Amino acid sequence: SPILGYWKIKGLVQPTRLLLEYLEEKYEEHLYERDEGDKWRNKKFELGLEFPNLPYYIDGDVKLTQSMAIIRYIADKHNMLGGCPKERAEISMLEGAVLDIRYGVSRIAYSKDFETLKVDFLSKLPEMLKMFEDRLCHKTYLNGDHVTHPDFMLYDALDVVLYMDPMCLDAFPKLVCFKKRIEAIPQIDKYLKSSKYIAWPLQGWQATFGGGDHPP
Amino acid sequence: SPILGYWKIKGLVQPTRLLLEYLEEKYEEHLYERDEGDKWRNKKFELGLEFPNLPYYIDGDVKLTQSMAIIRYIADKHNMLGGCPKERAEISMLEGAVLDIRYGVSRIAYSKDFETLKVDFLSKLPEMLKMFEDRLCHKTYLNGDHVTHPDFMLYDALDVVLYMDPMCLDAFPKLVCFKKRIEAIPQIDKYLKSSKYIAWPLQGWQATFGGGDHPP
Ligand SMILES: O=c1oc2c(O)c(O)cc3c(=O)oc4c(O)c(O)cc1c4c23
Ligand SMILES: N[C@@H](CCC(=O)N[C@@H](CS)C(=O)NCC(=O)O)C(=O)O
Ligand SMILES: N[C@@H](CCC(=O)N[C@@H](CS)C(=O)NCC(=O)O)C(=O)O
Ligand SMILES: [Cl-]
Ligand SMILES: [Cl-]
Ligand code: NA
Numbered sequence: 001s002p003i004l005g006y007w008k009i010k011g012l013v014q015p016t017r018l019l020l021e022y023l024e025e026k027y028e029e030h031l032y033e034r035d036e037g038d039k040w041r042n043k044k045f046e047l048g049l050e051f052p053n054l055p056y057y058i059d060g061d062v063k064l065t066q067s068m069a070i071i072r073y074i075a076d077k078h079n080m081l082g083g084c085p086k087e088r089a090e091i092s093m094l095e096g097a098v099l100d101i102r103y104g105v106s107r108i109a110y111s112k113d114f115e116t117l118k119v120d121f122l123s124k125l126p127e128m129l130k131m132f133e134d135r136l137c138h139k140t141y142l143n144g145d146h147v148t149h150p151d152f153m154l155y156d157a158l159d160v161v162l163y164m165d166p167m168c169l170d171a172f173p174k175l176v177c178f179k180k181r182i183e184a185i186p187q188i189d190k191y192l193k194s195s196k197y198i199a200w201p202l203q204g205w206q207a208t209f210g211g212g213d214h215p216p
Numbered sequence: 217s218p219i220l221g222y223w224k225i226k227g228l229v230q231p232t233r234l235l236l237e238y239l240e241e242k243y244e245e246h247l248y249e250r251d252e253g254d255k256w257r258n259k260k261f262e263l264g265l266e267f268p269n270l271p272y273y274i275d276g277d278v279k280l281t282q283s284m285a286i287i288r289y290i291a292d293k294h295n296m297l298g299g300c301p302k303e304r305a306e307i308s309m310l311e312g313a314v315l316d317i318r319y320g321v322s323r324i325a326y327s328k329d330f331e332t333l334k335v336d337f338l339s340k341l342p343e344m345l346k347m348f349e350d351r352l353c354h355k356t357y358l359n360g361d362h363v364t365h366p367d368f369m370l371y372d373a374l375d376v377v378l379y380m381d382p383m384c385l386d387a388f389p390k391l392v393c394f395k396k397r398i399e400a401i402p403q404i405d406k407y408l409k410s411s412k413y414i415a416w417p418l419q420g421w422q423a424t425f426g427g428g429d430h431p432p
């Protein structure tokens with residue numbers, strides 16, 4: 001079974017977990033806890049990784065790091081990255097537009113100045129969300145009628161910004177519908193209700209936003 | 217002919233420019249100068265872009281944004297993204313490892329405390345560069361004998377960190393060699409002496425590091 005290694009947090013790997021659960025792929029999750037930073041440091045250069053980091057993905061055929069390389073590899077092995085340069089580029093464009101939101105959060109979540117930085121991020125967020133709302137006015141999922149890895153990336157981003165402001169999706173009914181649609185996929189619904197789901201933290205435990213042992 | 221739209225800076229699109237010149241592709245670059253933000257705002261939503269942003273790339277088949285979608289599309293049109301999931305994932309892993317460096321710079325380059333933040337980045341930089349130095353010990357380019365788009369991404373990142381610290385590659389002879397090897401590619405050599413080459417700025421003009429109209 002492939003091994004997925006990461007901290008016991010959502011962070012960079014949550015979209016990858018959602019994709020694996022949608023595919024019903026068996027995988028072995030190797031998780032590092034809040035106080036296991038030393039265990040990681042003693043294993044980091046002992047795994048055969050060319051660019052040692054978390055997350056990592058090991059399946060015998062490959063030893064990968066970089067969260068986007070890993071999610072794309074899993075999608076690629078299941079023939080989901082797109083059928084021609086045009087479709088593959090549309091999927092990569094969706095990826096990058098989601099990362100603008102998700103890194104917008106992570107960039108400020110460890111700052112002691114978070115409560116002021118959050119205000120600026122939430123003022124810029126609507127312009128980004130509007131582009132996805134428009135994209136979803138004619139399509140069921142981000143790439144049309146079938147699920148692609150960016151849909152799970154967007155789901156993760158929406159989950160995270162709703163912790164920052166539970167009202168930030170009120171002006172975007174298509175995004176509220178999209179989020180409920182992902183949750184209604186049978187594999188996802190079972191996963192999210194199960195003990196396998198990691199609901200918290202969103203970032204590292206030391207983060208000012210999305211850290212700690214429990215949601216506030 | 218394809219149109220590439222961006223600010224008249226290196227920024228997010230320099231590796232794409234290098235790739236297009238390496239491939240000897242015909243393209244038109246439409247640049248926005250320091251005082252042309254109004255020009256961009258007047259056409260941002262009139263170009264048919266689904267996720268309007270800079271850079272944009274428009275050809276007869278696609279209207280793209282997101283700098284990484286654009287570079288991947290150009291590579292994909294020339295069959296350079298990788299021959300199997302394993303090779304495509306290694307190229308994506310190299311991408312992400314370069315972006316760790318390049319965004320490490322951009323994250324701090326606009327801060328008025330750049331002089332203090334720089335120190336931490338330059339402290340982390342050697343262990344990031346060491347992974348590339350090791351990769352080039354057994355391969356000519358990052359993916360082997362042939363150039364891939366991550367090679368031009370790495371070139372761009374080395375050019376930028378050398379402005380931050382001229383000595384930061386002194387401990388990495390293979391990276392010093394790699395930078396000169398890219399500059400020796402005849403298409404790149406000619407590009408660097410052409411009217412199209414943008415030598416400065418590295419970031420937006422308003423950046424504390426890599427901004428202004430000329431280098432320090
Ligand atoms: O601040 C950022 O840090 C990053 C990284 O440190 C990185 O390794 C990759 C990325 C990336 O791919 O996309 C990004 C964005 O679209 C964005 O708006 C901000 C950031 C990043 C980013
Ligand atoms: N660009 C990399 C970033 C990886 C990263 O920053 N990982 C953090 C956790 S979110 C870490 O703890 N890395 C372990 C290390 O550097 O030793 C990716 O997307 O995978
Ligand atoms: N993740 C996006 C970031 C794009 C971005 O931030 N572009 C800046 C310049 S570096 C911009 O000026 N966008 C114009 C706008 O937002 O209207 C990418 O890689 O292309
Ligand atoms: Cl705590
Ligand atoms: Cl100036
Ligand atoms: Na706590």
Ligand code: NA
Pocket residue numbers: 428429430
């Ligand atoms: Na100046």
